[PDB]
From a paper:
Here, we show that a core component of the fork protection complex in the eukaryotic replisome, Timeless, harbours in its C‐terminal region a previously unappreciated DNA‐binding domain that exhibits specific binding to G‐quadruplex (G4) DNA structures. The FPC comprises four main proteins—Timeless, Tipin, Claspin and AND‐1—that are conserved from yeast to mammals. Inspection of the amino acid sequence of human Timeless revealed the presence of a conserved domain in its C‐terminal half (residues 816–954), with a predicted fold similarity to the myb‐like proteins of the homeodomain‐like superfamily, that bind double‐stranded DNA (dsDNA) with a tandem repeat of 3‐helix bundles (named here N‐term and C‐term). Our findings indicate that Timeless contributes to the ability of the replisome to sense replication‐hindering G4 formation and ensures the prompt resolution of these structures by DDX11 to maintain processive DNA synthesis.
We used X‐ray diffraction and NMR spectroscopy to investigate experimentally the structure and dynamics of the newly discovered Timeless domain. The 1.15 Å crystal structure of amino acids 885–947 (C‐term), corresponding to a single myb‐like fold, confirmed the presence of a three‐helix bundle characteristic of the homeodomain superfamily of DNA‐binding proteins, extended by the presence of a fourth C‐terminal alpha helix unique to the Timeless domain. The N‐ and C‐terminal domains adopted the same three‐dimensional fold; in particular, the N‐terminal repeat shared the presence of an additional fourth helix, H4, as seen in the C‐terminal repeat. A distinguishing feature of the Timeless DBD is the presence of a fourth alpha helix in both N‐ and C‐terminal 3‐helix bundle repeats. Superposition of the DBD C‐term onto the structurally homologous domains of the telomeric protein TRF1 (Court et al, 2005) and bacterial cell cycle regulator GcrA (Wu et al, 2018) in complex with their dsDNA substrates shows that, if the DBD were to adopt a similar mode of dsDNA binding, the fourth helix of both its N‐term and C‐term repeats would likely lead to a steric clash with the phosphate backbone of the DNA. Although it is conceivable that the DBD might rearrange its conformation upon DNA binding, the fourth helix of both repeats participates in core hydrophobic interactions, mediated by conserved residues L872 and F879 (N‐terminal repeat), and L936, V937 and L943 (C‐terminal repeat), making such rearrangements unlikely. We found that it bound with low micromolar affinity to both ss‐ and dsDNA probes. Indeed, when we tested a well‐characterised G4 sequence present in the promoter of the MYC gene (Ambrus et al, 2005), the DBD bound to it with nanomolar affinity, and about one order of magnitude tighter than ds‐ or ssDNA. While Timeless DBD binds to both ss‐ and dsDNA, it binds with ~ 10‐fold greater affinity to a defined G4 DNA sequence.
Author numbering: 885 to 946
Write the structure that this text describes.
Amino acid sequence: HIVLWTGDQELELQRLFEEFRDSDDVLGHIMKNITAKRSRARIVDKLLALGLVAERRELYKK
């Protein structure tokens, strides 16, 4: 794996998150669509660090 994000990798993460956030497996759809190898837990932490979600439970809303 890698653990840092280039500017373009961050923008890609955001586009995929925006698309898949209402699915039942947002992280799975993100991971299927990025080329870099990354762990699920690190991607979750990056979504939090960017403020795309404010806390973990927002990744799976009712």
